Design a protein around this ligand. Structure first.
Ligand SMILES: NC(=[NH2+])NCCC[C@H](N)C(=O)O
Ligand SMILES: NC(=[NH2+])NCCC[C@H](N)C(=O)O
Lengths: 223, 224
């Protein structure tokens, strides 16, 4: 039953996503414990962090300076972290948040960031925000790793149908109607005609985020 | 074709199992790196007592070479001096390997349960002096549950063994640490899919090595 397949895929998706959240929150707590620049570098420049996220950086409220874990990239004349969506989202939320999809400053690629505020341990005053960049391509690939029927794919949307992750990276950050036709989420399994063929499409909410995972399966193989 | 099919099932479980074990390894390595960077007691306490660490492992402890003292992330565990971490298997394994390693199954000091531990040595950043070892306790029951959750075939189960057939994780906990011959009646690993008779009924059995360990995932599939 498709509902059972997509319900199982949402469980996995949550684990994938919650794993990234847990690591991001761990690094952020250790940083809050002692936000000395050298301790921040040590915390974010370990293999675990460099292998989980595309890039990690701490932007400072005081002066728009930043500490990050890729020496190859230093921000140009231009770049002020304080103007970036991950910065503001974490500051506004005052706790760990994941951004909507947006275009990365350097590459233009569509991504999301796990973002956390950093508060002064003593005062409680906002010092800045940390971003943990997440690859949507890798995300799509992960939630598509174990598939049961080998005739379709898994995707992730926000509640308004904005694509978070699709196997084809060209859909990331775009409305899901670009590959489903329909623009609003119909959670219940239903038939969608694509290219003249019938597919069963079904969604399941992702615990902890305002995302759904969706499934698109060729019916003649699906059943 | 049926042999190829079962082959693909154990391979799939092997891949997922490797991803999970490497993930836990990476987390232990990270923490060990942060501790090594600054092993002051309060910094160690701060590093190992976070939710990420308490949720990934059963228990985490840093035992010291100097006096056999320790810092662990379980506030209700306060072993007295008859618990010397320096004589424990995980401690010696970490010291011997000089890097991250996973133990063979052994009996836990407190519970007597058979578990394994991720183990890492810690060295003085400046002088290279050996300071002690950290253990990261892994539930074998939870491993058996993990590799059996995704089950494509009708009836049967999944298990883990070392290269010489020592059981790492079986759905039935009493087999943990035991030779696999106790539930397979074979003592040597035959990687290729092959028929095994167990209590009169035939089963398909097959193995796939786990990347990063000399472990194999095994499947026992009823041939109804
Ligand atoms: N790969 C990079 N160097 N990215 C730099 C930009 C960092 C962050 N994702 C932003 O857009 O603000
Ligand atoms: N749950 C516990 N308090 N275990 C204490 C023992 C720690 C470690 N597994 C050992 O046997 O040395």
């Amino acid at each position: 039953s498709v509902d059972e397949i997509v319900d199982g895929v949402s469980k996995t998706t949550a684990e994938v996503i919650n794993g990234r959240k847990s690591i991001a929150q761990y690094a952020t707590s250790l940083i809050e414990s002692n936000p000395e620049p050298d301790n921040v570098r040590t915390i974010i420049s370990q293999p675990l962090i460099k292998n989980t996220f595309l890039l990690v950086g701490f932007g400072l409220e005081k002066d728009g300076s930043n500490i990050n874990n890729d020496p190859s990239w230093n921000p140009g004349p231009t770049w002020d972290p304080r103007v970036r969506p991950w910065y503001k989202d974490a500051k506004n939320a005052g706790k760990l948040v994941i951004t909507a999809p947006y275009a990365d400053s350097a590459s233009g690629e569509i991504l999301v960031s796990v973002a956390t505020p950093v508060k002064d341990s003593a005062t409680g005053q906002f010092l800045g925000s940390i971003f943990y960049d997440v690859s949507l391509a890798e995300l799509a690939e992960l939630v598509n790793e174990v598939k049961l029927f080998d005739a379709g794919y898994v995707f992730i949307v926000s509640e308004d149908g904005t694509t978070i992750a699709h196997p084809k990276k060209e859909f990331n950050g775009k409305p899901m109607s670009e590959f489903l036709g329909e623009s609003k989420i119909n959670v219940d399994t239903h038939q969608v005609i694509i290219n003249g063929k019938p597919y069963a499409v079904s969604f399941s909410d992702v615990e902890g985020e305002d995302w759904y995972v969706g499934v698109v399966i060729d019916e003649e193989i699906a059943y």
